[model samples]
Target chain A: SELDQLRQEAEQLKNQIRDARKACADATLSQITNNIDPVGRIQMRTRRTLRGHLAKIYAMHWGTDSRLLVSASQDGKLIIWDSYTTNKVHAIPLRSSWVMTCAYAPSGNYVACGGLDNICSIYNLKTREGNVRVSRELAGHTGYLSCCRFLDDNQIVTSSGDTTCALWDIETGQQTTTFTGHTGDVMSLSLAPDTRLFVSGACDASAKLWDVREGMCRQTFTGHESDINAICFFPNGNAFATGSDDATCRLFDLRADQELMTYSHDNIICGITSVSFSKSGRLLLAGYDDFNCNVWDALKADRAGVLAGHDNRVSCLGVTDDGMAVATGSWDSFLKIWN
Target chain B: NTASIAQARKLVEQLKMEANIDRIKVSKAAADLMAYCEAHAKEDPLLTPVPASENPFR
Candidate 1:
């Protein structure tokens, strides 16, 4: 009994010491807001409107080529659209209609999608036959799959309602690692440019960074008042931005291990559903429940433009690979590309 | 006691991994960011209407 008590007390002290050390380091980190210059506003307009999905669009992602986009809908179909031509290249019928997220692999040959089925299915576009066939299905999560992204051609990462993030090997369908930290459902994931790290946003209103190789949480950031619905890494990978149900978007710097800026307004009462950044890291785009997507100066934290056209809430959006345009999907079953 | 020891070991390893990341200097990152943005600034193209025969979404 004495040995057990001593062990418990010793572990508690170790945790307390770690907490204090982190706080001290954070306090010493430099704050650079005062010296930064502001980038001016932008004038963006809808250049094309893509219409094909029968129901509300749940998620959308841009291919590495920047010419193609894959959008998942509540109607149980995944449509690959040529954003430049406004034509549906391929339409795949999903096994389930409850898809909450979809991802375009960098290889331009594979796409991954998942939702209430709790399984991440990978489809190879180059080898599909008459019936849209799933090439691989990675299953393990006990809860709904919230979001997924391909780490590379052979590996992918997924977040779940089970409050865990998992890395899967696409070829063997084996679980490479599991990351558990968020106290609530992990709603979104954003992979860094280097692919060595990724960030996750959760219903707990906290965003965490994890090392891809070790499956260990590097840090956790908490400031949002409600659920964090979306997270996106800056092109430079030194920082990231998050959107939350709290109706605000925040930028967090990794070196400082603290929030650098908060982008919000007095009249923006609705939640933000999705966030993305331009390839140059100049503009941050956030999709809102108010049926609009707002672009902000990434460094200045100033509003650059507001894209408004969807009849319903904007659910997902992404900037193209070359930074030429942005694509937004809505609950109105419409996707619009802006330039 | 064994469980506690394992937990401590995991925490130490996590902290080590966190510290190992080579974070870039903020000044160089900011400079490169602006330069890249300037080089890839969006350019408006001359709009040309599609011919009725080739227009699919119309």
Candidate 2:
């Protein structure tokens, strides 16, 4: 019995040390890096610059080649940049309403952007031309269109402020199915690699998996205490990660209907704005509201390092396919590239 | 682009002024003046009191 007690005590002590380490890491990262590394005790390597957005930057995506980054701003401008050179490549000025979200089509041939204007525009990436504007605006959502992703080249899925999600056929520009399970704004969405299923996170503090073919919610994952700002299926498709306003990131085990672990962050996870599995699937990158993005060893749940530099809340994030760099857009109006 | 931003900004200002003027217009004459401005101005005249610092009469 004494030995068992000792084992339990040792386990508790181990957890305490982990918590202390995490706390120290959080405190050191809460401020912008003057010059120090938060975890490694070496000099910091990343640098940040503020861009010119009249308002907040909400969504961003990296082009397939990983050389270009595209961002949508609440001020209604979509800007594409040379990711490495940090130079503006192109700008698309919107008429009136904010462009709440934008994503590059997988082929990098086109980009889809949606926002308060209730219109989702598909822009040609190569020729810089506007193409296939949805004729009858995907209706049903009474509020702003918060997020959109290509289900395939021909189909698109969108989450809206009306607390609903809709699947649309891009060819005909018609709504194919409307999902109404989320009780709050559906702020983020991710399509599984297989393309048969997708996950959506909402302000309702829950994430749902949809059977895209069946047009129904197949699973509901609930654990976060606040609005779910982001969700992404792991490359494997058996699991997914959710970022919440509760200031934590959670990994969900789809097979078991259970949460595997919680990754704590320093501030309200405004937009777990981005989550990506490393090319090798060994690491997970998550961006948060406090301008700090983290790299975690997904299997071991260890903190590999933090990427920090943004002066304002991180509104959107993306990682390159090679896993060597990350791009983050913030309320400060600038998008920063971290390597 | 600057013109568009200015137009948006002016429309917002006009809406704010109309909302304020409608809130405070008590007499028929005041309402008539407001109505006249609404009908005649290229954009609605902000009948709302200018900030005290901006109001020459005030």
Candidate 3:
């Protein structure tokens, strides 16, 4: 009988909280327009073409120094390129040609790759001899590892087709926590600057926020009409943008817990494969299946520029840490640097 | 049973009160975001280009 009273009181409290949030949401929208400036048109051009991968380039990530890049390709190779010179620093041949994702660790000493192999592989880049063996294989996902990000040098969080994301200890090759909330495959992930909060987007068309330490979902953001293939945070860590198969990108603010804007146009009909924000958070860049990267004004929600050069669909894109350039991988088997 | 009922009542009241306090926290977060937006509205950080070096690929 007492439990029933507790339940009823909790229900009432939830309703009150919802009403309070609704008011806060209204005020936030009004205040945002007053404080933010409009982003005008921008000009971006392809500055370099990194030509080493022989087949489709599926995923890429930028180094912490903003000059190095790592990419996974269907050609059975993972290449680290010095983006400034378009030179291949190290080419590591992979056992699997079906890889889909790769990530560069913050420390620049290690890299991770995963895909249809159903396991994540870590490699040490500091070995001088060819026989060195400090590599670790994190094998736990029942389905394909779709995405992985290093929380730091020692820890990583991975998302998979198993409809779950797992945190792993890099040195131990042990699972630390499993985050389960999405009903479909978890497709993409972006960790906030603080490392305590992270956001994941999935084929379920929902992005969720999680407290990394608590291993609990703090909020779920829903707005995308189809699969969210790519997601990235604003440089300031206040909001994030998601590129969806719906041919649109949406910005969601964490503070208001609401969608702030949507970037779309009538002529674009292809899905977006990846997304990233410029260093200043003024422009949003999206890699589309149409072989084009559309730059949108983050605040005004208008088209700022179009970067078109790739012959095939743009598969993945990332903004450099210093915001000096953008790197995009394509099915044409080349990564292009734009500035 | 009555003692358990009394303990449950206290716990529920505490939860209800905490909810009231947390609602204020969410609103404060929104206001703080506005302050951030205003402070950073004028800075442009994307203009500087990486200094180029002679590449044999070129």
Candidate 4:
């Protein structure tokens, strides 16, 4: 019994020492990394591949909490899915138009889609499994709605090829007011994280910030020499990011109404089709027409990483609220999740 | 991180067999990132977007 006890204690001591050594090594390693690069690293690999759409994927939005991903595709399919699991929340089909843009309401209980149909359609996820009907249809735009977003619990704002963005009262299905000024096609819009301001990007190479209350253009961001394809607000709400066909993403200041920084690669040709920011607001994620989703240090103005895997253009991207994961929807008919 | 790269290469192989992507370019891109990290084992840079205190560019 004494011999067995001694042997057991020796093994335990060895394990304890081994564990301590590993802990020390790990701490040292992390310390060195943290000193050299305080921000750590971005996981560039695609952790999941979601394939089901028969045509190109257009736009994708993550619920504020980052649990659900709402995606619309050119195949006329709008899918609500869980990015981490094989579980699909819903797969609803559109009637005729190519679903260009989609957004999950702040509550996540509802979804809104608008596109070539010249109308915005809302659906409740709580609807019965088999049969689903349009909860409401918002119509007024004579041209294709290029982008749609739920402004808040009771309102929505959309931009269209008609060079105007219209604000809607959700419950009443009424067009409250129209924000107009862009000389060309208004391709994209971004809602401020916590304010009554939203920005729109147009083919006129201009981005205009509008007040949600009066439907007035507060400020216009002008710098890009080409079409502005994608736009998103910074987490701080004082600034915003816009990706343009000129192969650049410009960071704009709302208060000063000036371009803060321009993120561009040395060797560039592909147009930036989409733009997003990590939840921490430390990285600018932009999708290019050449099928690369490039990550830029938002402050340093350096290209941090590039996500390249899609067969076609990387049309859209969304970073989860945790700042640890990202989802990209490409024209290749697929959605890929990266961490 | 190595596991992610290994899985990425495996995914590229799968993509080569499944999707119609430009495998050569896509494969090169995947390897570039992996090899870049391997080469930069000595140093890394700070990367993240955060709020500006006062408009830095202004």
TM-score leader: 3
Greater-TM-score candidate between 1 and 2: 1
The residue-by-residue lDDT of candidate 3 on A104-123, one tens digit each, is 98998888999998888887
**CAPRI band for model 4:** incorrect
By lDDT: ranked, best first: 1, 3, 4, 2
User: How well does candidate 4 reproduce the true complex, by DockQ?
Assistant: 0.02
TM-score to native of every candidate shown: 0.83, 0.68, 0.84, 0.75
Task: Compose the digit string of candidate 1's lDDT tens values, residues A159-232.
Answer: 99999999999889999999987889999999999999999999999999999998879887778999999999
Q: What is the lDDT of residue A102 in candidate 2?
A: 88
* Candidate No. with top lDDT: 1
Q: Write the per-residue lDDT of candidate 2 for residues A170-284, one digit (tens) a residue.
A: 7787888887667788988988878888899999898887888787676667788988877777655767888877767777755444455677744343556666655444456
RMSD of 2: 24.3
> In model 3, which runs have C-alpha deviations exceeding 4 angstroms?
A1-21, A27-37, A128-134, B1-58
* Best-performing candidate as measured by DockQ: 3
Question: Candidate 3 or 4, higher lDDT?
Answer: 3
Runs of candidate 1 exceeding 4 Å displacement = A1-37, A128-131, B1-58
> Could you tally the backbone clashes for each prediction?
0, 1, 0, 5
TM-score of model number 4: 0.75
lDDT (10s digit) by residue, model 4, range A186-241: 99999987758899999999998888887767665678999998999876676789
Residue B57's lDDT within candidate 1 is: 27
